[PDB]
Amino acid sequence: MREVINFNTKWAFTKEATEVPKEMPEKWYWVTLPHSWNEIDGQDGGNDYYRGTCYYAKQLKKSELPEADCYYLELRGANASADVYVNGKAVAHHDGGYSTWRVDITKELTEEENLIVIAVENGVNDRVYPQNADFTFYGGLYRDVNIIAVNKSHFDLDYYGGPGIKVTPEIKGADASVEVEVFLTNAAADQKLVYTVKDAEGKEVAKTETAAGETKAVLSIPAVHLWNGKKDPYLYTAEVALVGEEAVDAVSTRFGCRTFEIDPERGFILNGEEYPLRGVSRHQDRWGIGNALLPEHHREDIDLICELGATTIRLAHYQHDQYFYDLCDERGLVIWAEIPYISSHMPNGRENTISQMKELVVQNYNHPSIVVWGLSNEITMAGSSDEDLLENHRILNDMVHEMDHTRLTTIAVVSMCDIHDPYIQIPDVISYNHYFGWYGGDVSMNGPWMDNFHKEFPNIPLGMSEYGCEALNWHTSDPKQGDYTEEYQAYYHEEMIKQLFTRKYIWATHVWNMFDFGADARNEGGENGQNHKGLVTFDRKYKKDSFYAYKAWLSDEPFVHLCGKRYVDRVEDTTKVTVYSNLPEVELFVNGKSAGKLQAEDHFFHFEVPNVGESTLVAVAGEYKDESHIRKVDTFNEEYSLKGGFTVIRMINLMGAAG
């Protein structure tokens, strides 16, 4: 007899208030959640996006409410910190705007029209992470806000926004012994607890029944369909109801049965067999709506990834939407979750890291797609690992292991960090963020580098948590580093794939980023307030040529992509044309005539054709084909040009990305 009520519409908002209003405002701005006040100023550049305290005000009419014993206000996203006032009385406080938190307000609903006021703030302080990072801290209620109506004896809702249900299976041969642990609040020894494990087809495959004191119960599943990533993302269902002789409450959750390990030589191991983890990472925002994403947005993001064919996603730099974690469990994607413990180590940040990390594990413990909790991201950029930074990581690592005996801890190390740093020895596995080819250096430096680490620390699994190159609608026939051309980004990734995908000991690679994201301090390229290191544009409307270099290596969709379709005007008399394909052979036709056939085991077909007038190029591979257009010109079209040993200007735009 549990009920969740949406509470997203009719929310008065303002950034001008300097106090909680005693009466419901009348001349405030009307917003419906998800919402953020940085959806515009947090994507245009300048590092100017307003950061302060803003207020949401809405009225919870006691009448338009189902009759229950306890009423909880559920918030799933309040970046960064929030206070919840009811009838002008402070009722709750939370820090870190990426985790679910709730509050009991039954005793505070005295009047008929109770005024709920929520003050949100995304300002600066030494207490709450993130404070120094390369992504806009969109402020506001950018996720759902609910009201939960349950009985006085309900599954705990007051523990770090947890689900009140813990499911940890154990695979013994071809069977599984699933331990389901539920948590209660104000229970009675009388009422029973009925555990139920249902099939993916809603078929009851087992069941138990204990007492209010027996919050643990080991069910058994014979002939378990194991969760096997994309091969077979099977999912079971666990339901536990608190029964007098009728259900007074009931939590539920899906889970998956699988075993994994991260061999330092064989890479990722999924359910016994080798399962190379090669994928991307994504930020939780979209152009125009900040992070006020809708379920469709989560669905479109993960759909482009499944098309590209990634086997893993790095959901940095914080906790992501529950619906997206559920989508990964559905599609069988192996997932990396972490916390905003990024960049500089704030000694006063301890209290927050434990809380957020606690929230990340309690809330996402049942997702079979998660396998690693990240403790930090480039946390040594400020200085080096003094005692505090080291003790801070030890606490989180020990804490994570204490609550989860099924997953491994990891960290993402900044490029400059020496491999002998003390804190690289705390987590179970580690990964590096290397931009050889886009920051100082050459793309060829990545392969040897990863090798050098593997030599000094062969039993510490090494991975690539980050690597990428910027690319906009600039083009050139002479690709270089710093021209921001789509062409160069294709090369950079071409060689990156050849080096990383052929090294089995790199447990996971994660392109940075799948999509361009918002970072209001970035003044790079022609478009400011944006990081253009993605394979797909911020509006998710254009797939860059690099998108298809990865599809050729990870996708079963037979295809043929002619690169550089936006580079029509070309001055050279013999121009280079690149075709991507997961097919053995490709033939390119310039103006109907055949320019020759090409084989490329690396899937990177590099042709050369004559640049004569307006030509219509066509690339065939079996029954699959693609077409592009070129045109000979006298001089280079300036519409294509955007005009560590970086140039002065480039380095300034990069230095500005701090503040």
Ligand X SMILES: Cc1cc2nc3c(=O)[nH]c(=O)nc-3n(C[C@H](O)[C@H](O)[C@H](O)COP(=O)(O)O)c2cc1C
Ligand Y SMILES: O=C(O)[C@H]1O[C@@H](O)[C@H](O)[C@@H](O)[C@@H]1O
Task: Report, in this order, helix, strand and coil percent for the chain, each rounded to 5.
Answer: 20, 35, 45
- Asked if 269 interacts with ligand X (CB under 6 A), we say no
By a kind-dependent CB cut-off of 5 to 8 A, residue 41 interacts, out of ligand Y, ligand ZG5, its own copies, none, with: its own copies
- Asked if 328 interacts with its own copies (CB under 8 A), we say no
Q: Which is nearer to ligand Y, 215 or 319 (CB)?
A: 319
- Of the candidates 501, 397, 460, the one whose C-alpha atom is nearest the C-alpha of residue 262 is 460
Helix (H) or strand (E) holding 559: none
Looking at the DSSP assignment, which residues form a beta bridge with residue 182? Answer: 165
CA distance 397 to 201: 38
> Which single residue brings its beta carbon nearest to ligand X?
159
By a kind-dependent CB cut-off of 5 to 8 A, residue 32 interacts, out of its own copies, ligand ZG5, ligand X, none, with: its own copies
Q: DSSP label at 449?
A: H
Total of residues contacting ligand Y (CB under 6 A): 10
Q: Which range in 30-38, 79-87, 312-320, 381-389 contacts its own copies by CB under 8 A?
A: 30-38
- Give the shortest CB-278-to-its own copies separation in angstroms: 37
Q: Is 487 considered catalytic here?
A: no
Instruction: Pick from 2, 51, 94, 166 the residue near ligand X by CB under 6 A.
Output: 166
- Asked if 167 interacts with ligand X (CB under 6 A), we say no
Cβ atoms of 106 and 47 within 8 Å: the answer is no
3-state secondary structure 274-314: ECCEEEEECCCCCCCCCCCCCHHHHHHHHHHHHHHCCCEEE
Query: Is beta strand 334-338 parallel, antiparallel or unpaired with respect to 370-377?
Result: parallel
CA distance 83 to 94: 7
Helix axes 486-500, 446-456, angle to 10 degrees: 30
CA distance 404 to 329: 18
- Asked if 492 interacts with ligand Y (CB under 6 A), we say no
User: Widest CA span of the chain, in angstroms?
Assistant: 88
Q: Which is nearer to its own copies, 294 or 612 (CB)?
A: 294
Q: Which is nearer to ligand Y, 392 or 513 (CB)?
A: 513
3-state secondary structure 245-274: CCCCEEEEEEECCCCEEEECCCEEEECCEE
Q: Which range in 143-151, 471-479, 627-635, 650-658 contacts ligand ZG5 by CB under 6 A?
A: 650-658
Q: Which of residues 384-413 bind ligand X (CB under 6 A)?
A: 403-404
The letter for the amino acid at 617 is L
Instruction: Pick from 510, 533, 561, 603 the residue near ligand ZG5 by CB under 6 A.
Output: 533
- Give the shortest CB-416-to-ligand ZG5 separation in angstroms: 8
CA distance 178 to 164: 16
Instruction: Pick from 79, 136, 531, 582 the residue near ligand ZG5 by CB under 6 A.
Output: 531
Chain residues that interact with ligand ZG5, rule: CB under 6 A: 133-134, 377-378, 414, 433, 439, 466, 512, 531, 533, 644, 654, 657-658
What are the binding residues for beta-D-glucuronate?
134, 317, 377-378, 439, 466, 512, 531, 533
Chain residues that interact with ligand Y, rule: CB under 6 A: 133-135, 377-378, 433, 466, 512, 531, 533
Residues catalogued as catalytic: 378
Chain residues that interact with ligand X, rule: CB under 6 A: 156, 159, 162, 164, 166, 183, 361-362, 365, 403-404
Chain residues that interact with its own copies, rule: CB under 8 A: 9-10, 13-16, 26-32, 37, 39-41, 44, 50, 52
